[PDB]
Amino acid sequence: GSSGSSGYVCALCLKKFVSSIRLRSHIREVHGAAQ
Ligand SMILES: [Zn+2]
């Protein structure tokens, strides 16, 4: 995982999450970042 901390943070809205999956999926739900 990441170095230090207890969670992962959005690069867009700077919100914190319990996991890298909870972060990855947040971006698709509200920032709409597709492929
Ligand atoms: Zn965000």
Name the residues around ion ligand 1, CB cutoff 5 A.
10, 12-13
Sign of the dihedral through C-alpha 25, 13, 8, 2 = positive
* 3-state class (DSSP) for residue 9: strand
Taking the C-alpha atoms of residue 16 and residue 10, their distance in angstroms, rounded to an integer, is 6
Q: Distance from the CA of 3 to the center of ligand 1, in angstroms?
A: 20
Contact predicate 7/19, CB 8 Å: yes
End-to-end CA distance of the chain: 24
Phi, psi (rounded to 5 degrees) for 31: -100, -10
Structural determination approach: NMR
Of the candidates 6, 23, 5, which has an alpha carbon nearest to the alpha carbon of residue 15? Answer: 23
Q: Which tokens in the block code for residue 25?
A: 């999926």
For residues 12-25, one letter each, b for 16 or more C-beta atoms within 10 angstroms of the residue's C-beta and e for the rest, the string is eeeeeeeeeeebee
* Ligand 1 centroid – CA 1 distance (Å): 19
28 is annotated as contributing to ligand binding: no
DSSP string for residues in 16-28:
EESSHHHHHHHII
Residue 31 Cα, ligand 1 centroid: separation in angstroms?
Answer: 7
Is 34 annotated to bind ligand? no
Give the span between the Cα atoms of 9 and 1, in whole angstroms.
Answer: 13
